[PDB]
Amino acid sequence: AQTINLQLEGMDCTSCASSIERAIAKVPGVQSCQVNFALEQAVVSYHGETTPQILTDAVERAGYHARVL
Ligand SMILES: [Zn+2]
Question: How far is the CA of 40 from the centre of ligand 1 (A)?
């Protein structure tokens, strides 16, 4: 697995934290996604064709914003 951290914007509540996990989990190649609500960060484990930029697009499409750390 490869791993990447994303900084998250718009995650004001734990419902939205779950929304972000669900959106990231749908990305082909994602194996696991740990959303840290307190730290406004997601740790994503992946393989396959996943890229950091496909991950931040998933977050955008779900109605939030991410940036690659
Ligand atoms: Zn919310």
Answer: 12
